[PDB]
Amino acid sequence: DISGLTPCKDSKQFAKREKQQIKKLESSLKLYAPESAPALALNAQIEKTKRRFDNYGKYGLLCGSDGLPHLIVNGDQRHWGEFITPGILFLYIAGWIGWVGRSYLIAISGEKKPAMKEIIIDVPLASRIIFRGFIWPVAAYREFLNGDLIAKDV
Amino acid sequence: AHWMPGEPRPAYLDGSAPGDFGFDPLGLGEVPANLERYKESELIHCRWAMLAVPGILVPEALGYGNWVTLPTILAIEFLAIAFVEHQRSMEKDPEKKKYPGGAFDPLGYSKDPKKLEELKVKEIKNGRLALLAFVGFCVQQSAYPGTGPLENLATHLADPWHNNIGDIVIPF
């Protein structure tokens, strides 16, 4: 109920959005037979919409006066599924990408012509490294403590 | 002679200073001039807090004032204290800025240097303890608005395993 936003499980305009989209998809449904592929696909999209709205209701999303879910990023424990848990889920993958790429560039750095390994990606080397970014939040922390994360100028 | 035995003591404080335990993890006292100013200010903060804490618990044990008009008492305070503080600022010898002696040292406690060093250690230890005690007073008055320090000690001694800091430090 924060920021003047009513939850979507007890919002009027949210249910109105639901009803309006369902009537829109049903207006496009009285043009085909109820057993053919178009009508079946339209009914599947209808159930998709209804479950979508009900899932946004049951997660405790906050729907404003416009009747759309307004995500809360401030750090409220009820709304960590909005930003903070998927934010950690992001940063874990993003640091995976960065860490496997960095360890790859460091792996090829001791090559005769390293640039050809950035064009012709050494798939065995990367694949042996591709899972080494699973542990990036600890390996990077140690490389920061040991001094191996940041390079020295010389 | 170390705040956490095992941590490497920095190079700039090693035990020689009166109250040296090697607690400079942020590296504030790196340069010597700031270090000297810091120990001066430390002694002054210490002496003010040690003047304060017996001016808190003694009114609370008997008076129960809870340690809680302007344009005259404020003026007399500023006049009486700015004079002393600037006259203190006008000294340039640092060991005499921390420990003037002379007209400030009657009773001859500063007559023997070894006992002078031991008493400087005593001053700084009791003073750090009193600074902690005053910060405790302030935060215990912030958390509990309308209670006294000795009142809080009675609250602890009543049921210590149920009335402690934990009630404020975690939400539960």
């Binding site: - | 790196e30 340069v31 001039a33 700031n34």
Partner: protein
Amino acid sequence: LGPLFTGQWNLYAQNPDSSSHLFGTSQGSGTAILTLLGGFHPQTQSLWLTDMAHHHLAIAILFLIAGHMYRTNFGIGHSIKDLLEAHIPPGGRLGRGHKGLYDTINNSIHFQLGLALASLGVITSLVAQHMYSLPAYAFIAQDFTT
């Protein structure tokens, strides 16, 4: 000026145009000249002229006090050169601090111009952000193109 010299400044905030004032006529007006009642005039949806008067007065006190800061021909005041050579942090984080900066600004007209345009642009955006929200002119909030 009895209230001003006698210190009884509160006598200048006695009848602060008590909410029925028509801008340009004595109906619902008052006698105050300097107020801090804040908010907007109800007719104009603008700031009170007494608030602007007290405002410019207060910042006049501040600027007239601040303009007696820097050293001049009368023996007192600050030298900005030593203010800058004194603001060098021990620790070497900033390094040599603001040393030699008075000479590289005062000789450099482009540095003066850059700092001036910095401040001017920020306060111009401030003029915009505060004239749209806190209009200080009568009947400018209700007209919408200006």
